[PDB]
Amino acid sequence: QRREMILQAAMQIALAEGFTAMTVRRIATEAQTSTGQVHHHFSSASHLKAEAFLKLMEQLDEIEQTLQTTSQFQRLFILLGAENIDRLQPYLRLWNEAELLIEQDIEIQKAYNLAMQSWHQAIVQSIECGQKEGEFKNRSNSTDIAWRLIAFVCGLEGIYKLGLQGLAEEDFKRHTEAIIRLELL
Amino acid sequence: RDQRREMILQAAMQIALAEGFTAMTVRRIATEAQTSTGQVHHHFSSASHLKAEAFLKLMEQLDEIEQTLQTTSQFQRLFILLGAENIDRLQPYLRLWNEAELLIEQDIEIQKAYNLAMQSWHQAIVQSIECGQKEGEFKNRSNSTDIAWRLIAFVCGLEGIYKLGLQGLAEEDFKRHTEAIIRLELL
């Protein structure tokens, strides 16, 4: 299909050069079609940016369910983006890129909340699976654990941006580890 | 030292709490301090320099207000120290803290004062944690420094998720989620 071929075409340029490099001329050249055909398929320049982002976070989610995880503790560590595995930094960079564009773009803002809700229910599925298999304790509401876990990993990342003195950036995995043990172990 | 320099500072803090940083022009501050524009420039290198200096004083003053709040348990003091208690008197100081967070990228003066206030915030939470441990109220699971950084990172992250307008996010659980994290860490 012509459309999905241009949908893909927006993904690798998004996954590599970023959002600002995703113009109709850039993706029509990379898809090797007329620019005219790109305006035909997609309703707007922003609509394509959001739909390339949403379908790419779904891609991130899809491979994220095909990892060799020893324990459910490991799977949840990856699910929080705290492991920073080798072939996932592109997708995580685009997620962080979309975090700043939600103020200026209404399409990107829509898809960001969409990916955030899917990220939450993916962690909710992680808490309930571990509890049903004996790996995790049942201390509190699974939904509430997931929101506090998301708030902590997003909050720890923000405190790292400030260049604070005394804090170590090598302790991100350690602090995330300790909070998970207190919540589920 | 200079009573004239302190007079302009008190005017800048007065404008900062009421309206915010954008209304803190030295034209408006000089009028508030009943002086000339040239006098403000004599004591402060810029409106941004005077903005960061007045911000540090307001956060030092907010600190002093939280400590005059008659509290009993140290676990209760940790609540107002994290800003989750929702106090009417303390709303303008917390409003300016969030306002200063958005100016750290475009203002190097305010950015310096923001990290200083955050380091003083981490100091007080460390102090309150170690005080509750000496009284046997809190447990010694981990060091006070790590728990204080984790507590600051949680409240900052929880308020950020609320800004997203996410569906099913409950703003009124800020008190509940903060009460939880404190219990897992120290209680």
Residue numbers in the entry:
A (entry chain A): 8 to 192
B (entry chain B): 6 to 192
From the primary publication:
The polyamine-binding protein AmvR regulates the multidrug efflux pump AmvA, which is pivotal for transporting polyamines, an abundant and prevalent class of amino acid-derived metabolites. AmvA abundance in vivo is transcriptionally regulated by AmvR, a TetR/AcrR-like regulator that senses cellular polyamine levels and enables the dynamic modulation of amvA expression in response to fluctuating growth conditions. The overall fold change observed in AmvR is characteristic of the TetR/AcrR family of transcription factors and consists of an all-helical regulatory domain (α1–α9). The AmvR protein can be further divided into two subdomains in each protomer: the N-terminal DNA-binding domain (DBD) and the C-terminal ligand-binding domain (LBD).
We successfully determined the crystal structure of AmvR complexed with spermidine to precisely investigate the substrate-binding pocket. Two AmvR polypeptide chains were situated within the asymmetric unit of the crystal and formed a homodimer. The high-resolution structure indicated that the stoichiometry of spermidine binding to AmvR was a 1:1 ratio (one molecule of spermidine present in each protomer of AmvR). However, the overall structure of this TetR family regulator remains largely unchanged between the apo and SPD-bound states, unlike other regulators that exhibit substantial structural differences. Notable alterations were observed only in α4 and α6 of the LBD subdomain. The α4 undergoes a movement of approximately 2.8 Å to create sufficient space for ligand binding, and the α6 also moves to enhance compactness. The ligand-binding pocket consists of the residues in α4, α6–8, and loops between α5 and α6, which form a long narrow tunnel. The side chain of E164 and N103 in the α4 helix, along with the side chain of E106 in the α6 helix, moved to form hydrogen bonds with the amine group of spermidine. Another amino group of spermidine formed a hydrogen bond with the side chain of E71, which underwent movement along the α6 helix and the carbonyl group on the main chain of L86. The hydrophobic interactions provided by W102, W126, and L99 are also crucial for spermidine binding, especially W102 at α6, which shifts and stabilizes spermidine.
